[PDB]
Amino acid sequence: EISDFKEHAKKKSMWAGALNKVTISGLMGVFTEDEDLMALPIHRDHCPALLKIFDELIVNATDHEKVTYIKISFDKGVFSCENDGPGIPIVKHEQASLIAKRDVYVPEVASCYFLAGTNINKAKDCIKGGTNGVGLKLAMVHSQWAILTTADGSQKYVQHINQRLDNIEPPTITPSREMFTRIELMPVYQELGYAQPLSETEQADLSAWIYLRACQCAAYVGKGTTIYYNDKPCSTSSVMALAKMYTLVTAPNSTIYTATIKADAKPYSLHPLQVAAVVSPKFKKFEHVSIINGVNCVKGEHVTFLKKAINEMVVKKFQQDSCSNIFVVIVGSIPGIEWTGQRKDELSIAENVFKTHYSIPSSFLTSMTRSIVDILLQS
Numbered sequence: 001e002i003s004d005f006k007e008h009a010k011k012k013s014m015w016a017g018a019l020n021k022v023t024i025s026g027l028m029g030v031f032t033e034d035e036d037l038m039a040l041p042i043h044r045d046h047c048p049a050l051l052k053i054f055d056e057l058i059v060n061a062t063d064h065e066k067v068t069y070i071k072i073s074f075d076k077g078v079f080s081c082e083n084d085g086p087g088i089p090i091v092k093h094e095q096a097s098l099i100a101k102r103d104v105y106v107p108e109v110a111s112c113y114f115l116a117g118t119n120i121n122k123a124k125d126c127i128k129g130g131t132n133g134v135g136l137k138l139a140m141v142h143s144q145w146a147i148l149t150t151a152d153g154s155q156k157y158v159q160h161i162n163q164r165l166d167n168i169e170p171p172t173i174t175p176s177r178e179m180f181t182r183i184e185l186m187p188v189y190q191e192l193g194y195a196q197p198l199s200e201t202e203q204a205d206l207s208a209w210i211y212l213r214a215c216q217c218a219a220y221v222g223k224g225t226t227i228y229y230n231d232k233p234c235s236t237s238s239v240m241a242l243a244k245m246y247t248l249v250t251a252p253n254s255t256i257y258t259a260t261i262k263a264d265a266k267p268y269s270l271h272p273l274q275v276a277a278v279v280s281p282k283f284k285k286f287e288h289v290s291i292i293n294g295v296n297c298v299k300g301e302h303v304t305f306l307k308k309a310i311n312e313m314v315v316k317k318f319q320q321d322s323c324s325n326i327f328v329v330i331v332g333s334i335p336g337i338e339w340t341g342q343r344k345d346e347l348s349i350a351e352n353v354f355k356t357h358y359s360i361p362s363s364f365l366t367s368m369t370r371s372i373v374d375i376l377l378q379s
């Protein structure tokens with residue numbers, strides 16, 4: 001058989017991950033207990049592709065980020081993401097219109113054409129997460145119904161995109177003074193293994209997962225942008241706040257080691273990396289949370305660079321594993337990375353980029369090493 005994009009994306013895990021519920025190691029959400037935000041594990045199977053619907057929209061918003069807000073909503077199964085800043089241009093796309101037999105505007109190409117977007121010829125120093133021109137189409141292909149709304153300050157464009165991209169309805173274009181981009185959709189929950197409608201536990205888990213993703217965004221975006229989840233601001237705007245949120249239950253009142261890792265030469269020098277770490281004997285193994293180019297990256301040589309520097313100092317000080325008692329948060333942009341798949345689970349880079357260009361403050365390493373060695377000595 002020869003498949004098309006749409007049918008292939010509905011059947012193949014390569015685009016967004018598994019298309020039913022599986023065990024997702026390290027799956028976390030944020031939950032509220034009287035004034036406090038705590039990240040907690042979600043020890044139930046979930047559908048990776050469903051979580052990717054949400055992630056693709058969220059990263060598109062952080063990529064655009066002037067942008068003063070990103071508003072994420074999740075209620076009655078309906079997910080939406082809206083950001084301000086310039087809208088998607090409301091102009092006819094001449095290629096797509098010529099090939100098709102009708103008018104096709106840019107927002108339809110952006111949302112309905114695979115391998116299409118503004119990052120196809122991305123520069124190596126561009127720090128947007130988006131690269132493939134795929135992610136928004138994956139959101140549409142996994143939607144029972146979806147609505148794209150965008151406005152450019154002179155016109156507003158509304159288009160319904162239904163039935164997993166089978167039913168693209170003609171857009172409605174009106175004069176408007178607004179300026180934003182909004183995607184609203186209902187995922188195909190039943191096809192992805194969920195109840196219709198979501199069960200109480202499915203709803204609670206998904207809401208917690210989205211809220212945590214929003215909190216991660218709050219630490220990544222520029223200081224002019226506010227992140228909202230269900231109309232309430234997400235105020236975990238620093239790596240320190242993230243580190244607290246991830247360690248509040250296990251190690252309350254924790255000391256937070258902080259550093260800004262900076263590079264000497266452009267383009268690396270344009271992109272300092274923010275780090276916060278917590279050291280506790282209660283931690284069973286090394287864990288990191290990395291938000292790189294807006295993407296929650298689970299594997300990359302940036303982590304290894306930090307671990308080796310810590311290990312270097314711990315071995316020396318102990319003489320006078322070294323990382324199993326560490327939880328670390330790393331947030332920032334890295335130019336020149338390559339992702340290993342559309343999911344962007346792992347970034348790829350030469351380890352020597354960090355060795356040549358980046359400096360980890362010695363005061364941060366020294367402070368961490370002292371606490372690490374004390375734990376080792378007390379054992």
Ligand SMILES: Nc1ncnc2c1ncn2[C@@H]1O[C@H](COP(=O)(O)OP(=O)(O)OP(=O)(O)O)[C@@H](O)[C@H]1O
Pocket residue numbers: 056060061063064083086087088110111116117118119120129130131132133134135136137181
């Ligand atoms: N929220 C948004 N605001 C503004 N433009 C957007 C937004 N979402 C998508 N776009 C535009 O639509 C294009 C297509 O988005 P899509 O997610 O499919 O591709 P991408 O982000 O370029 O790459 P990737 O497949 O890696 O996510 C983007 O390149 C961007 O130009």
